[PDB]
Amino acid sequence: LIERQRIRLLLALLFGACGTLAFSPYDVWPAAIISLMGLQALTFNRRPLQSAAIGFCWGFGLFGSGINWVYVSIATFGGMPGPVNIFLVVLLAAYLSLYTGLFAGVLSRLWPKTTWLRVAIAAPALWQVTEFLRGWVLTGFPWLQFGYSQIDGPLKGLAPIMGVEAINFLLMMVSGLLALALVKRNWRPLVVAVVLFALPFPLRYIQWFTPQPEKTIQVSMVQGDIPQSLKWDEGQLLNTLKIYYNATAPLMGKSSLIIWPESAITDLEINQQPFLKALDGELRDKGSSLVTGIVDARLNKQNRYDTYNTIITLGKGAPYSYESADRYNKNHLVPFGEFVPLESILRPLAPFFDLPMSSFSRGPYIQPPLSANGIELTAAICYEIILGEQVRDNFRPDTDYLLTISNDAWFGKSIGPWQHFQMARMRALELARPLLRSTNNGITAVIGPQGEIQAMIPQFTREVLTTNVTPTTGLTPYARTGNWPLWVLTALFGFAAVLMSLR
Ligand SMILES: CCCCCCCC/C=C\CCCCCCCC(=O)OC[C@H](O)CO
Ligand SMILES: CCCCCCCC/C=C\CCCCCCCC(=O)OC[C@H](O)CO
Ligand SMILES: CCCCCCCC/C=C\CCCCCCCC(=O)OC[C@H](O)CO
């Protein structure tokens, strides 16, 4: 028989890479089940170290093929030779692949026999703990979670109840039973798998929200398409400010809310006071509000400058003040982009090399929703929208819309900005709120309360997306409880499965 560990590692690579087809650009949702079926079936009847090796290679295919878009960021930021960046991409993919090896290795140790307890009970619970660590250890990088591939799929109804991680759970469960049915040539796990998969379908029709048409507003989002910063001089700041203002001016009397993307204003907040105070007056005059990203350096009590990635509000119902509490400061910073890991390497800084000291500061985990024109917006900047629990914790029942401002000009023309967009849609469906995503170039859109794309403008263009958005009010089960029910389910599955293994 050709079942040999060399073959299994080769197939793990292909079934892992197959998982990339499930996500935003390709959107083949059944690829998630086939992907997880390979991981489930290939680890059958293996030593714990052989299984861990197969789990690693599955993760290497998935993350190698689907996360490789980070290269362009490493290339332009890191300042490294070409093959060094390639090595660093292989490094990152390997790091994430560890958690998949850990999953397979632990699963094979406690549940070596190929049984429905292994695939249906132990696997989903362990996968939950595994995938939790991947997105937690260090800052965490929970990219490529197959739950997001169901945003338009049959399992979308599960999301507003138990959240996206419940779709991760059920998919690992259903894929496990199918791998068992195939390997053991037994139709019974197939029937259960189909039933477990089909039952959540009617839930996609439940509306846990209700719209508020009397609050319908016309919202505008300016896609500035301002290029990467090659030279910062007052000539580029004046060009940027002109582009954004000139696009906002004709909308001042019509659109109740105007949004500019992440770090849209390319100068410090303290250096723009005349501009902003004058812009706040013009908006209040015509009865409009502006929400724009800006980089804000702020003197601490210690008299040291703390630089924030901010969101500031202007206009009607949001009078601009540098001391205003109506602002959002980014919390979760990109590990190598916005801060430096291991700041304690300051010893080689002064003697020998020129080491980066440049690092952003973090805002609070919980922040009140931005108010503009009497509209409540719970903001998340860029990467932060992929963090399900953080967005839910900040979410308030009076929130009218979810707000994301991002700058994806890096990773442009790649799968990355789409995978990012796909996870932003998940937030709207989970919380039953419209989501307003204004970016610099990549994927400016409006997403309804069920995750449907309401309006969208093409990438890499200089445009304004103006459309009517009506807010929603009610509370979903996930918005109340969060992922506590899933962790309760995961505990009961792990309790049973470990108790069964220990007997
Ligand atoms: C030891 C029983 C507990 C199992 C817990 C495992 C946890 C491993 C997690 C990640 C490592 C993934 C990297 C894969 C490296 C394994 C390859 C290997 O070492 O296999 C060589 C084998 O000894 C040749 O016969
Ligand atoms: C996040 C919400 C998703 C959670 C969903 C909760 C569903 C759990 C219910 C039952 C477990 C399924 C176990 C079914 C076992 C399959 C039947 C089977 O395999 O029996 C044939 C056997 O091979 C011959 O001995
Ligand atoms: C002996 C080897 C053991 C191997 C283990 C494999 C199976 C793991 C099973 C269950 C993990 C239990 C974790 C459950 C903890 C519940 C966490 C919780 O209360 O939720 C936090 C909250 O929801 C945040 O927002």
Side-chain angles (χ1 to χ4, degrees), residues 1-356 359-503:
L1 182 56
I2 50 166
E3 275 318 297
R4 291 218 304 242
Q5 180 79 357
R6 300 260 282 173
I7 299 307
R8 291 196 181 197
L9 303 160
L10 179 66
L11 292 163
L13 216 51
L14 307 161
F15 279 98
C18 161
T20 295
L21 304 171
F23 292 101
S24 197
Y26 313 115
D27 290 315
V28 187
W29 72 251
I33 293 170
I34 288 135
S35 192
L36 295 168
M37 270 178 75
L39 167 67
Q40 204 75 85
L42 287 160
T43 53
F44 284 161
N45 305 304
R46 286 291 102 164
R47 294 197 302 272
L49 234 62
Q50 303 178 287
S51 178
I54 295 155
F56 176 87
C57 298
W58 184 91
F60 200 77
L62 179 76
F63 299 118
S65 64
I67 301 305
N68 56 6
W69 50 265
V70 295
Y71 177 86
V72 294
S73 200
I74 308 162
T76 313
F77 282 17
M80 298 263 195
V84 175
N85 314 296
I86 289 158
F87 166 77
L88 296 162
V89 177
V90 171
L91 191 60
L92 169 65
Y95 162 70
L96 306 156
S97 301
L98 296 176
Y99 298 87
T100 321
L102 173 66
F103 164 80
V106 171
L107 185 76
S108 180
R109 173 85 130 88
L110 287 101
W111 304 273
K113 303 179 178 190
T114 78
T115 183
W116 75 262
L117 179 91
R118 180 191 160 115
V119 301
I121 309 302
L126 183 59
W127 189 245
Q128 180 61 38
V129 176
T130 289
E131 286 312 291
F132 160 78
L133 298 172
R134 194 164 66 77
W136 178 78
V137 179
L138 301 168
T139 61
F141 194 48
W143 215 268
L144 297 182
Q145 283 182 358
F146 293 107
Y148 301 103
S149 81
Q150 294 286 328
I151 181 70
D152 294 303
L155 308 178
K156 76 184 285 161
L158 203 76
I161 299 172
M162 294 187 196
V164 70
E165 294 149 280
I167 309 175
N168 305 342
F169 198 90
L170 188 58
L171 283 167
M172 179 52 80
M173 193 168 201
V174 169
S175 302
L177 297 166
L178 294 164
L180 178 77
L182 174 134
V183 164
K184 274 192 161 174
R185 288 168 317 178
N186 185 359
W187 57 273
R188 290 158 190 87
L190 168 65
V191 163
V192 172
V194 176
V195 168
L196 290 180
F197 190 82
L199 285 178
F201 191 87
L203 309 174
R204 74 195 262 122
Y205 297 116
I206 311 166
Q207 286 181 39
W208 286 277
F209 63 95
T210 178
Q212 299 174 293
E214 76 282 342
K215 296 216 273 217
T216 304
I217 59 172
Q218 200 204 51
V219 75
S220 280
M221 287 168 294
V222 189
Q223 196 170 262
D225 199 31
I226 58 177
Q228 288 285 268
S229 67
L230 265 279
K231 189 80 172 180
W232 191 84
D233 58 293
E234 267 288 333
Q236 283 312 305
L237 173 63
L238 291 168
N239 211 319
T240 304
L241 294 170
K242 195 196 184 182
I243 294 168
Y244 278 107
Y245 175 96
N246 285 1
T248 305
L251 313 160
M252 294 183 50
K254 302 90 179 176
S255 303
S256 305
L257 179 71
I258 304 126
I259 307 155
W260 299 351
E262 175 185 25
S263 307
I265 294 168
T266 51
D267 191 19
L268 299 173
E269 201 185 311
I270 199 83
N271 299 342
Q272 286 307 315
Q273 290 303 282
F275 175 85
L276 298 163
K277 298 276 176 190
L279 189 50
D280 167 64
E282 292 190 31
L283 295 156
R284 169 182 302 100
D285 286 15
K286 294 219 194 175
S288 283
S289 301
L290 181 74
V291 169
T292 173
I294 194 169
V295 183
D296 164 38
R298 209 166 274 261
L299 297 95
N300 201 63
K301 291 173 190 174
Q302 187 71 50
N303 207 88
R304 293 284 114 91
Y305 273 96
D306 288 334
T307 298
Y308 295 113
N309 200 329
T310 314
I311 305 180
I312 57 148
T313 52
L314 306 100
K316 182 169 177 181
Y320 173 72
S321 181
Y322 187 81
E323 288 87 340
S324 188
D326 194 29
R327 59 188 45 251
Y328 179 85
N329 301 298
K330 217 200 184 198
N331 175 91
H332 195 100
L333 308 179
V334 173
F336 287 91
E338 284 162 349
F339 82 85
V340 63
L342 299 173
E343 88 300 322
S344 41
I345 59 183
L346 281 151
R347 306 170 166 89
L349 173 51
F352 326 124
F353 334 94
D354 309 83
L355 289 169
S359 300
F360 269 84
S361 303
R362 303 174 193 261
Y365 182 86
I366 301 295
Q367 293 191 264
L370 310 163
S371 194
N373 236 307
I375 308 154
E376 288 280 279
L377 293 88
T378 54
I381 299 166
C382 189
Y383 175 100
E384 296 188 311
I385 205 66
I386 78 163
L387 318 169
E389 200 54 31
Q390 196 173 309
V391 169
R392 181 222 82 84
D393 291 321
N394 282 261
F395 169 87
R396 294 295 163 256
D398 47 287
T399 303
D400 293 314
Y401 312 96
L402 303 170
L403 169 82
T404 322
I405 62 156
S406 187
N407 179 5
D408 288 342
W410 28 84
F411 337 131
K413 289 189 214 297
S414 84
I415 55 171
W418 287 98
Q419 300 180 342
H420 188 9
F421 180 59
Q422 197 176 29
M423 300 180 179
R425 297 174 60 205
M426 188 77 269
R427 301 304 147 256
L429 170 59
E430 289 181 343
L431 303 174
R433 286 305 183 270
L435 177 133
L436 309 168
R437 191 171 137 93
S438 77
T439 60
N440 186 64
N441 56 326
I443 324 283
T444 314
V446 167
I447 288 104
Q450 289 172 112
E452 75 268 37
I453 307 169
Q454 271 190 23
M456 207 193 114
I457 54 174
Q459 282 185 283
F460 333 112
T461 70
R462 204 184 249 92
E463 278 197 47
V464 168
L465 169 55
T466 306
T467 185
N468 279 79
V469 291
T470 182
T472 62
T473 181
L475 269 159
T476 69
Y478 178 75
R480 291 182 203 115
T481 55
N483 71 147
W484 283 94
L486 172 90
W487 277 114
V488 164
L489 181 70
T490 302
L492 296 155
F493 272 31
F495 179 89
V498 176
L499 158 70
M500 226 71 87
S501 183
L502 270 40
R503 99 229 341 163

